[PDB]
Amino acid sequence: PPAVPQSFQVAHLHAPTGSGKSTKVPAAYAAQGYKVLVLNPSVAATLGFGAYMSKAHGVDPNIRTGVRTITTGSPITYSTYGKFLADGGCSGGAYDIIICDECHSTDATSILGIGTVLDQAETAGARLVVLATATPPGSVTVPHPNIEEVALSTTGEIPFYGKAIPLEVIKGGRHLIFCHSKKKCDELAAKLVALGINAVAYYRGLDVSVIPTSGDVVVVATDALFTGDFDSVIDCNTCVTQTVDFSLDPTFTIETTTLPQDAVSRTQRRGRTGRGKPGIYRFVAPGERPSGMFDSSVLCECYDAGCAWYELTPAETTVRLRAYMNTPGLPVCQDHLEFWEGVFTGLTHIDAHFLSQTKQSGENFPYLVAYQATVCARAQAPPPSWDQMWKCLIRLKPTLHGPTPLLYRLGAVQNEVTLTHPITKYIMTCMS
């Protein structure tokens, strides 16, 4: 815990989970008479701090999330990076100390939020910025006290990612099995449920309240997932993630790649067990990628977010992303700020109605999707395909004729394509 500097400084706080980085530290800071802001990526976590802080420190802090804002008049304020960004960044409140919790997060919202703080804090009159994380870049998953780890072998009743799982290890007790995809979760759950195992699947879109709080159960899930009280965690050791492919067909492609998990993934997955009692962790693979790297698609995602949700100009987003990149000790990505800024700067005059639809649909890159939809509508051309991503253009379907003026690829392109649209040619110059 960095002492409050005489002048503005940015500090890194590397301390293990449970050490109080997002609770004890801000409590000690505020007790010294400071206005402290704690930024966290999770809406659930942010809300949770309220009760924990009250119980642990007799503090009722202000809570700011997209769903609910609870103002208490406390010197401590907990907020998600999203809400912070939405409240205008440093102009949304006056804080002396900003704790950027879980600063290892490589999701667009955390990166944009951190960069905002790094760029704005000093000028806004803050005294200290703390980048806190139990897993700084270059991290690896080191032995845990309560967790026995054991490799899966080829011996077992259930084939699992090249290895196999012995029914005996899951027959009694509560266990958590991590699969990389929802299909695999379903398939495994089905397999086990057939073998008499009380297996239930869980992933984004499902209902977590159906998972029993007590009693034997094998939850087969993705990273979407809680008082699990799991006797063991079995991990596939791989993860699906967004990746950009500068494919020049005609421009770029944002898809997904199944990669070996990194240290954050392994630590968090393994971390579901051994909570206040011994646990077992079974794995298919012994390796993991050191934490600390993130894909350029995240940068694209940051610009998309500024445009879709934060009223930010690509030039403005660049200022924040630049600050993030200028500060040592944070996760790293390839310096593609000029490139992505170039791309988004040309995506002018979007259809406001499509945008509102796309960001309401939970579309991953709402600005890119809505923009491609805009270009199609204006050309009375059909979307790249008729997959759910293009529901916005359904009502107009009968009128849409001709080849799709393809801007980039966000999915499968089934319709005929034209590369003559001005925007397509523009983005192509960004590739050169």
Where helices occur in 32-107 by DSSP H, the ranges are: 43-57, 81-86
* Longest Cα separation, the chain: 67
Query: What's the rounded Cα separation, in Å, for the pair 91 and 334?
Result: 30
Query: Is 53 exposed, middle or buried (CB count within 10 Å of its CB: 0-12, 13-18, 19+)?
Result: buried
Compute how many other C-beta atoms are within 10 angstroms of the C-beta atom of residue 128: 22
Write out the two tokens for 321.
């992303």
- List binding-site positions for Mg(2+): 22, 102
Quick one: how far is CA 220 from the chain centroid? 21
Query: What's the rounded Cα separation, in Å, for the pair 1 and 362?
Result: 38
Where helices occur in 217-312 by DSSP H, the ranges are: 263-270, 296-308
Residues of the chain with CATH 3.40.50.300: 1-135, 136-238+260-291
CATH architecture of residue range(s) 1-135? 3-Layer(aba) Sandwich (3.40)
One-letter identity of residue 284? V
Query: What's the rounded Cα separation, in Å, for the pair 394 and 398?
Result: 8
The answer to whether the beta carbons of residues 91 and 61 sit under 8 Å apart is no
Structural element, H or E, at residue 194: helix 182-194
The answer to whether the beta carbons of residues 241 and 256 sit under 8 Å apart is yes
User: What is residue 78's three-state secondary structure?
Assistant: strand
Structural element, H or E, at residue 365: none
Print the SS3 string covering 105-126. CCCHHHHHHHHHHHHHCCCCCC
- List binding-site positions for ATP: 15-22
The answer to whether the beta carbons of residues 61 and 78 sit under 8 Å apart is yes
CATH architecture of residue range(s) 136-238+260-291? 3-Layer(aba) Sandwich (3.40)
Count CA atoms closer than 13 A to 196's CA, side-chain side.
5
Q: CA torsion, points 136, 141, 145, 149, in degrees to nearest 10?
A: 170
The answer to whether the beta carbons of residues 230 and 279 sit under 8 Å apart is yes
Tell whether omega for the bond before 278 is within 30 degrees of 0, i.e. cis: no
Query: What's the rounded Cα separation, in Å, for the pair 187 and 92?
Result: 47
The position carrying tokens 């008049």 is: 73
Query: What's the rounded Cα separation, in Å, for the pair 45 and 47?
Result: 5
Write out the two tokens for 189.
């759950």
Pairing of strands 253-260, 238-245: antiparallel
196: left (phi over 0), alpha (psi -120 to 50) or beta: left
Query: What's the rounded Cα separation, in Å, for the pair 217 and 210?
Result: 12
Quick one: how far is CA 362 from the chain centroid? 14
**Rg, C-alpha atoms of the chain:** 23
Q: What resolution in angstroms does the PDB record give?
A: 2.2
Query: What's the rounded Cα separation, in Å, for the pair 22 and 100?
Result: 9
Residue 229, φ and ψ in degrees, nearest 5? 50, 50
CATH number of 240-259+292-432: 1.10.820.10
User: What is residue 63's three-state secondary structure?
Assistant: strand
- List binding-site positions: 15-22, 102
Query: What's the rounded Cα separation, in Å, for the pair 81 and 89?
Result: 9
The answer to whether the beta carbons of residues 34 and 74 sit under 8 Å apart is no
Query: What's the rounded Cα separation, in Å, for the pair 372 and 308?
Result: 14
One-letter identity of residue 139? S
Residues of the chain with CATH 1.10.820.10: 240-259+292-432
